[PDB]
Amino acid sequence: EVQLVESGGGLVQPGGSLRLSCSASGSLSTIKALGWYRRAPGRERELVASITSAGETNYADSAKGRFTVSTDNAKNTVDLRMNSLKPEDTAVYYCYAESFVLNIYWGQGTQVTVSSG
Amino acid sequence: EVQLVESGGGLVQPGGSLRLSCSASGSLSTIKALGWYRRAPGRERELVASITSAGETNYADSAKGRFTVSTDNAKNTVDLRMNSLKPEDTAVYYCYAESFVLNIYWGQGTQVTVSSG
Amino acid sequence: EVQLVESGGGLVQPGGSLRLSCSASGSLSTIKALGWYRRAPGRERELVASITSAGETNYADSAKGRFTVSTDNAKNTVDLRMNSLKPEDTAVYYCYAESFVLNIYWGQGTQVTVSSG
């Protein structure tokens, strides 16, 4: 079991920057990777960013270089830093923890939305 | 399923000739061979004659050369022509259709009998 | 099934000699070995002596040379001859018959005891 607690979402102006901070707790020594998923309307949960315990990080083609993800391992927090927000980026962002045995754990997810203008 | 309908039996004088005509219907394109069986009292159904779709014909040692079998494939009829009838030939003759998968189908059978003198 | 009937036990003076005679009956032609077991208080049934049908005889290290076992095959009796009885020898002696298929059959067992002095 891993408790994931997403935070930092809400409405923001387009082109703005936002930081999403997920707090993880539990048997995190068994967690292979921590990261974020997003679910836009009418499509499945796409991967956003992930950090392996080794520090190795990967992103989807929509996210490579554009976003950045970070952790503060002294407190088991995983933070995704959002920048240059687009209407195309509005989705429910789901924090996740993936075990070495490939079990996956999810946060409740935070709504991210941007003004129309 | 193949409907077999035997016909042409009955009483006949000994030494006479008779023609037994079986009408077949159904999925006859799946039938490997059409022919006739006989069951005399107190013994199992012996083979009499059979026609394969290739025309190849076989008979039991009691029937080789003695009897002849024929078809009119334009109407799916198989006819056995009986000749030189003996008291030893009286039996119920059962028409049969044998599938390529070796299923066998039988007619109701026709009684064949000969006068005592 | 083999009926074993132990006999000849009871109280005897220490340093004395005694003969235990077991009567066996049943399908003894299937019996590989006949012999005796003993059960002293607080320990499992130890082997005492056994006779194979070939005559080959074996004993435990406590019994080698000390005891002797015998049969009278004309009457299917197996006799163990006890000598130089010690306080250490008091136990319930169980006659046994062992099959070629390694089934084992037991007598009811006879109490053997020695005077304190």
Add this chain to the structure above:
Amino acid sequence: QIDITKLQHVGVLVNSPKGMKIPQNFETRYLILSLIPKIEDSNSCGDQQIKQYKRLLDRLIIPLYDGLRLMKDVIVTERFFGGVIGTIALGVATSAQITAAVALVEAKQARSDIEKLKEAIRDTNKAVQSVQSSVGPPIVAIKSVQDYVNKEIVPSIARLGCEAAGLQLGIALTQHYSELTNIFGDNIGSLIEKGIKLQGIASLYRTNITEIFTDIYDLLFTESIKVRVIDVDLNDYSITLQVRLPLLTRLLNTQIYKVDSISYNIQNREWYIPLPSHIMTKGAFLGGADVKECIEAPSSYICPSDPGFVLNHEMESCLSGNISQCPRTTVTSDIVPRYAFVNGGVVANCITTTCTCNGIGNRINQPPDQGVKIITHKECNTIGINGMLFNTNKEGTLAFYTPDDITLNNSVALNPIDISIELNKAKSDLEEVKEWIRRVNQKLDSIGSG
């Protein structure tokens, strides 16, 4: 044919000749598994458990239907003797699939009688029902749990109400789902191609096959043969089956023999001839028999098809009495018998068996170069093996063995490790030979230059 008397000299004990029965033909019959039982509560109390049971049947009936649709690989003259069965399809179908598709297109003419019958079986409550037709045999339908429903659940709906009646349905139907899953769920493509054993469906439904459709071993064989699925109704939850009543004939001039190989001594090591468990003759023919799928009656083996396979090795020459070609292999465990009773006497390798002639003290020693000891009643009146005393049979036909220099050069291994090890040794010797060849060729060059 088999030279049984000589095969004994290598511990090969060919025994128990039995004839063989093959179904020259099959009488077909149709069986309709109507998987939904009718209820009589008059208020749809049982509907809740019926719906969830339908939702379970999907997990088996939809895979079964999707499997059967692949057997639509003959596209549809037909209806004429020796006419075209149908057009081939765009795909690959092996001969087994083609045979199953041909069987399906033979049964396809039932489908109008199927449409006629389902109008009845949709309404009836009776558990096992037979319907006549213009085709010869009656067609039978089984409505899965109707006896239990009408005799137990129909009373219980009044006596105990919808609650208990509902639980009774839930339990009985989900049990029936576990039974159906045990019948229909494994190897679905093979189950469509080759069919389902009639034994299992009859165990599902206590079907009195002889009473429903028409010796104990013939009945066992009729249970062992496979009924083919010919239709699967996804809406009515109904499976239509072709039962195949065999017409068994005793095949002439065939015998199947059991062969048991005892251990054979070579220089105080145990070897045996690894012949197949059964061998068969067909007149002049001699080969193995894969009796594993056959029914072993006391007088004959009833097989679905001729189990014979030709012996590819010198095993045929071995069995024909050319004993010197029999393949040796080493014993591995107690599975290989060290001795056997044979024709009233005993055949055993007395090196690893205490053979005694007239009492447990007179051991029958065999020289290290003899592989088995054949102890006839002329030799010993009461042979004892490992202490077990037995009288030899005075009317035994066990031929007396004058021992001979039987040399079995065909040493053979059954284990890939042994073959790999000795092939590596062969390859190393081959490398040594190649090195010698290179050196000698170099010497030839030097002598030629000189």
Add this chain to the structure above:
Amino acid sequence: QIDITKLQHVGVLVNSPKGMKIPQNFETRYLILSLIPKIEDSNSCGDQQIKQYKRLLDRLIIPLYDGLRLMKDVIVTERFFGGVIGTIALGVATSAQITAAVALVEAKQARSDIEKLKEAIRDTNKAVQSVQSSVGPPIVAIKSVQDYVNKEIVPSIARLGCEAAGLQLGIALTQHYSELTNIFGDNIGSLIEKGIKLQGIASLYRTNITEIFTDIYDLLFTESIKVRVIDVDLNDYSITLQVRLPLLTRLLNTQIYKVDSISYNIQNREWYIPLPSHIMTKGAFLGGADVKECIEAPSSYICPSDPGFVLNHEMESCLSGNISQCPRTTVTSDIVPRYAFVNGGVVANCITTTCTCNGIGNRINQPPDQGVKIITHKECNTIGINGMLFNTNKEGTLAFYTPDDITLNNSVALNPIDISIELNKAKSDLEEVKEWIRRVNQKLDSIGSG
């Protein structure tokens, strides 16, 4: 990739490309099997059968507990991301055991919620119950036979008394023991290491997995994957299970192909290419696929893990179209198809199959040096095979075969006897070569001396 058109010339019929689905991740859920049902007789009438059933559960729960304690081979930083999982233990644990121990130490945090929940499940009568927590998913508990107990035995204790109620409990509970023994009793160490198939536990308890925890083939796959035992309570007779809901993804650029090998004639003898039953591509990769553990949906194979294994032999070159390297082996039985329908035409070896072109009288003879006959619709309008007349498909894509001198030098044997026999022949030839070498070396010595 596969050269399907050329592989047909050796009777290798690569067919039915299907994608492959792999669970990239698993959603975990917990299932608590509470093996003792609560009774409501208010007088401990059922206790006598409960005690003997507990005395039966010991025969399975104690071995299961003693097996699970061996998975305590990680000794317990933890609770920190990328921290140490634990200290190793004094013993040997293979990677499978280590993976199971890591899965156990991941689940170990449930144990305080387990302690919280058992306080409820000890008291409740309800058969299937779910409890929420601060962790995301509900945890569910099944109390083994509670529906039967409350709906049947609770009435019967009043209606029929302790005698019949007791017998009903005895029968139902010992049946449930036989079911549990069928689930938990075999291969206990593997069952602890690898887990139990969810199919069996759901069959025990009719569990509506989707309703309890959240396409038909996806559901079948969810049944096929193994739930791991994470705890076994010897005092409360309770087994805690980790159910693993797969997140399936269609893997891109992968196809699994079926390959069927028909008999191939060499000089009136039947041979075939013994390729694995399934082959797969992954872009440029080409190998076999061990689909045996996968679920064959109509469009894709759902597998628990990538079943691919690299083809070690020239089989990869064979499948890539370098046909001359395909390994021959001899046919053994009717299991190898002698013919097949292919792309609207037929591929068959007409030496052991009566192939006919436009009627059962016009046999399609093939020369003894051609191995298979490829009969396209351009050649024959109505091919008859063994009397079975079929029309060839006018839109069939079966490419016409101009025959060629295909020589297959890679003769291969599948039977250890064949390999041993021909290795003995090779070794005898090697001994002959060594004897020749000794003689020639002696002659060289004599010539040198002279």
Add this chain to the structure above:
Amino acid sequence: QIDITKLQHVGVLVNSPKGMKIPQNFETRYLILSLIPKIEDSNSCGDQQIKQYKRLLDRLIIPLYDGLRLMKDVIVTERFFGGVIGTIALGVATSAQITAAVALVEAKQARSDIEKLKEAIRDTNKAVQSVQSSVGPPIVAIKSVQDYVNKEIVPSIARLGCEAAGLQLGIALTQHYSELTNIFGDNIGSLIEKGIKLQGIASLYRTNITEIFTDIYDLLFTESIKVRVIDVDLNDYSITLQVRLPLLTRLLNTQIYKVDSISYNIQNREWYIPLPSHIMTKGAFLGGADVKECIEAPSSYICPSDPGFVLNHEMESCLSGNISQCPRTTVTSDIVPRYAFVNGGVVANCITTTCTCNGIGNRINQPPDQGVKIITHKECNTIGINGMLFNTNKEGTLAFYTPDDITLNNSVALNPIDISIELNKAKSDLEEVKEWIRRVNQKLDSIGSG
């Protein structure tokens, strides 16, 4: 004995020594399955379902009886110790058949007590009954479904009448037939020769074996051993069984060790030593152990007989520490572990495993010529394998490995295809050698002529 410390250097991890328990003797007991239940309707209402159930029992009891009559292959001095068991018969009987016939003629003396007891069991209604005799142990009889009949069907005949009582009998008895068929129907000749596992019959009849006839693993072993059929009454539908209560002894100076082989690197390719799963010592002896039929208790393996088989290959030398002779084979799949925890440290081939020493960034590289990396706590405090961080055990006994030129020349294949392929390559090289020999011999003839 095993050189465990050196075997680790090739990834062979000999572990978990357990003793071995063998039943030196068996206490016999008799069990009579009386397959027909008595009814108490006083009007023969149940007779109709009894008759059809008898007509089902025939399908199993007649094959079982006909099988048992073949065990009359000892013809019948007897009744005298060391007397003749009987006369041999005209046929072939292997040592297994002879052993079963000897067991039957040992039990044959029961048959007069059988005749005495059946007079009782024909009349009684009680489900499980024991009868004393002049022979020591009680003989027990089980009347198949009597509890269900007297407690449920006897009330129901009055409460619901002949119709429901009849259906209840039909269902219960045909279920009992399916259970009996699962016990008695498969492999009937082996089932007569070797017997039936007591586990199954007890599952049929919930038999409290210890209560009926007299540690959990000893009880499991008592369930695993086979009860022999000694009689089959075709008229009374009764099967008489010999139960065999083992007298287990801990065998001295024996240990069974598990051996797990991890992958071993040769030049970036994965190999392993294909040793048997278990090995055993007996003082100086060293061999494999076929533990598959044994019960694995936590401290010892309880086996029906000594499972040891002598290792025929250099495997004995390999296990004895002559590491250079260990047979290599190539890895095929994920079934071979790439790493293992060993004695507090890790033994792994770090070429196909990301081994890290004190953090996921410090990879433990191994040179291409070293096959496994042995990571002791002196080397690494917190070894990470594939990201999984573990502390090494400070009290671990994993000996430090100074690497060495371990050359394993015994390359071995497990697959017949590999052996056939490399044997074909060897045969081709042999043909090349023979051609060279012919050419050189011709040259010798030419030089001699000149």
